[PDB]
RNA sequence: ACCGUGAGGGAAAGGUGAAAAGAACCUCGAACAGAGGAGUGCAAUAGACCCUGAACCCGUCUGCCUACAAGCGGUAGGAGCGCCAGGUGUGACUGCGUGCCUUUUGCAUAAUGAACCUACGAGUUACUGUUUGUGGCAAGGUUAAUUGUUA
RNA sequence: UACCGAUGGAGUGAGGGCAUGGGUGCUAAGGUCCAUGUCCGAGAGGAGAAGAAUCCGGACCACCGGCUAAGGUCCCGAAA
RNA sequence: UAUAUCGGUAGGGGAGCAUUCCAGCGACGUAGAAGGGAAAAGGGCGACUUUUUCUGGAGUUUCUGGAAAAGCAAA
């Protein structure tokens, strides 16, 4: 059984014990519990439920493993030729690692 | 003691290699490399015949280098080599120091002449 | 404080401006002089009263 | 690190689902049929379509000499080519192509609707065109596709 | 005093030249050529980070179109029906279901087939 | 040194090792030409051009790719193969993409400029004004040249 | 929402295209001289095959989320 | 805390990194310094910084303040 759930503005297909990376959740610590409503589809191993105003009464419960994980460094470069304008910066996206414990 | 240990390791490693070197041969590395590519990977007695009868000038020095390498193998293995036993397992030609000369050209101009040298390395081994 | 933790008053010392040392500083290339004309040249001086 | 965890899958040579299909050109317009044939060869009818893989079907066209061209295009459409020598431009018609053989006209049309790269050059080799109804492609079991069903 | 930053000046070049490995010919190791090549590549990377979103959306739409035509609809009709019914599943999830979970895609289509 | 009839102009060029202990003797070879050994030495990949030993440039080996393919050579995707536990090499195939500097109303420009690398190379200092940040004293503020003591 | 005083530091004083009102020219010119706006200059992104200033639109960074503009939905090429 | 704002040439303003040397305070080094090769990690962002290993075989460095022969891609 899997579900389609919106976590931090992104729709993910999740199952029990799946170890997601999601957009950073602020003000949590390792081992904390986070609930996620907004389930759009439930596949119960053959039976499919589709929710237009969300699937009612469904949720995904997760545990925070790592509250802050940084992605790979990306170089951000701007240059306009013959104008002398040039700048180079670094960027790292921030994520939270979670583990799915229960799917309702 | 660090450099002594490193040197001892390298000295032990060299005992299992059978090679000879020619250094600062006052001839063109490219022309020498033609001969090297001709004899790379070839059985030693055929290589000696090829170098003896080759039409390149550098083959004469390559032949004596090959004989020296076979002698080094024989000394390090404490026995004489048999027929068809050894083969040219590695050979390389590197460029070496250049002599710079000046040659006059028309209307008062002077041009540079390069007299090049090379190094040759030959490793022999058995066709195992 | 002693000789090991000397500290000037806040805002008392300022770093000097260094031109002609690259694009990121904002002061390289033409080095604050504009493009051409008399005022861009080495040794230009203003004639006083001209 | 790979922080995505929800990725779109690309099909590859092992996981593509290629099939042999047979289409009929009894009374079809040439360009309209060839556009759908190009879609079939490209793989745009597959839910696992992948732009960098040959993922489409092998298409056998039968009754190719019964294709239809509207208007005066049988002789009025002028194809131009060049031999590369001075004064070397040459003219020909779809009629000249069809006289040479239906497969030449069909290949000329389908190429042009295929992508212009190495993948398209390979994909054009999956098209088989026959004048009659007699072709020898047993042991592949091509299924019969109604060309009018595709939209 | 005399100051020459030999080591730092050389280290900057060496750090950048580690990034130009794999390039063709002089563009991998000759420094003025290599540094020229690497910056143009950075402008390309900025542009392509934006273009990647459009490319992946186009791929999803094509896969959804094929699956909808298998089910009997077209992409535009299917998406109009989904929007009218208020289904918020995005094109990435729809394309994933179309490729890998055809029964789920079929149930979604059957929901709005009315 | 070299260049110039001459007046004159005018270079490049430091580093074995603590100590020469600077490699007796053997092997290949006409020959140290050079090397492989042995021996000295902490170390000879410190062996005389000898501390360290970078780049451009030149080779050999191993892995992967490559003989139906067409444009600044990258960038974003992405199989397969190969190494060492989720890292690393390569890159079938696909999308996008006319270097850089300078000068210009405007340059892929068939406008300028550079063979490449390493090293060198261009808003500095003094005095006097002025504005300002920060301070000391304050109806006052400040000494110059110089002098005394010990230095 | 940043207009004036006083003070420290400037650069610019070769402009260009389009629309509108005109002079000049031949009611020629990617011509030339003014005026009023606008854009390029100093501006990336989308459509127009490819185009400095025509049509849409002003780029803090990241995203394999969504809605739209001009313009489009047979294939190359997203969508009837 | 909210709201607003963050394309840029000439050009103005702000805040920093590295380099050589000095003062003060701490430290390291033949049980291996600087330098050279390879690898890994980090930074609102960046200039850059740490760590591991090989080579190397004798010096180097942290923080606070001070002073400049203080940074190259084109002449
Ligand atoms: K410049
Ligand atoms: K030494
Ligand atoms: K020494
Ligand atoms: K070396
Ligand atoms: K490429
Ligand atoms: K010219
Ligand atoms: K004007
Ligand atoms: K030092
Ligand atoms: Mg010679
Ligand atoms: Mg001869
Ligand atoms: Mg003469
Ligand atoms: Mg500026
Ligand atoms: Mg000026
Ligand atoms: Mg200039
Ligand atoms: Mg001017
Ligand atoms: Mg002068
Ligand atoms: Mg978008
Ligand atoms: Mg002699
Ligand atoms: Mg050494
Ligand atoms: Mg040395
Ligand atoms: Mg061909
Ligand atoms: Mg081939
Ligand atoms: Mg001009
Ligand atoms: Mg242009
Ligand atoms: Mg000129
Ligand atoms: Mg030139
Ligand atoms: Mg040029
Ligand atoms: Mg250059
Ligand atoms: Mg140069
Ligand atoms: Mg003027
Ligand atoms: Mg004027
Ligand atoms: Mg004009
Ligand atoms: Mg200008
Ligand atoms: Mg503007
Ligand atoms: Mg829409
Ligand atoms: Mg389409
Ligand atoms: Mg903006
Ligand atoms: Mg800005
Ligand atoms: Mg060590
Ligand atoms: Mg300097
Ligand atoms: Mg330099
Ligand atoms: Na000797
Ligand atoms: Na030149
Ligand atoms: Na500033």
Describe the structure.
The structure is cut from a larger assembly and holds chains A (104 residues), B (128 residues), C (50 residues), D (151 residues) and E (114 residues). Chain A contains no helices and ten strands. With 104 residues, chain A is an all-beta fold. In chain A, the strands form three sheets. Chain A has a four-stranded antiparallel β-sheet, with no helix packed on it. A four-stranded antiparallel β-sheet of chain A has the order 3-10-7-4, with no helix packed on it. Chain A has a two-stranded antiparallel ribbon with strand order 8-9. With 50 residues, chain C is low in regular secondary structure. Chain C has no helix or strand. Chain D is an alpha/beta fold. In chain D, 26% of the residues lie in helices and 15% in strands. Chain D is built from five helices and six strands. In chain D, strands 5-2-1-6 form a four-stranded parallel β-sheet. Chain D has a two-stranded antiparallel ribbon with strand order 3-4. The termini of chain D are far apart. Chains in contact: A-C, A-D, A-E, D-E. Chains A and E meet through strand 5 and strand 8 of A and helix 2, helix 4 and helix 5 of E. The PDB classes it as ribosome. Keywords: Ribosome, macrolide-resistant. 70S P. gingivalis ribosome erm-delta-porN strain.
Describe the structure concisely:
The structure is cut from a larger assembly and holds chains A (104 residues), B (128 residues), C (50 residues), D (151 residues) and E (114 residues). Chain A is mainly beta.
Enumerate the strands of the largest sheet of chain B in spatial order, edge to edge or round the barrel. Answer: 1-5-2
Strand content of chain B: 25-35%
User: Main sheet of chain B, how many strands, which sense, barrel?
Assistant: 3 strands, antiparallel
Describe the global form of chain E: rod-shaped
Main beta sheet strand tally, sense and closure of chain E:
none
Shape of chain B: flat
Distance between the termini of chain B: 38 Å
Which cofactors or ions or other ligands sit in this model?
potassium ion, magnesium ion, sodium ion
- How many helices of chain B? The count is 4
Rg from Cα of chain B = 19 Å
Strand % of chain E is: under 5%
CA distance, first residue to last residue of chain E: 86 Å
The ordered H/E elements of chain B are HEHHHEEEE
Helix amount of chain E, in percent? over 70%
Number of strands of chain B: 5
Tally of DSSP β-strands of chain E: 0
Biggest interface pair, counts: A-E, 20 and 21 residues
Please give the count of helices of chain E. 5
PDB class: ribosome
Keywords: Ribosome, macrolide-resistant
Entry title: 70S P. gingivalis ribosome erm-delta-porN strain
Chain A: Large ribosomal subunit protein bL21
Characteristics of this structure?
part of a larger assembly; 5 chains; C: 50 residues; little secondary structure; 0% strand; D: 151 residues; 4-stranded parallel sheet; two-stranded antiparallel ribbon; 26% helix; binds potassium ion; binds magnesium ion; binds sodium ion; RNA-binding
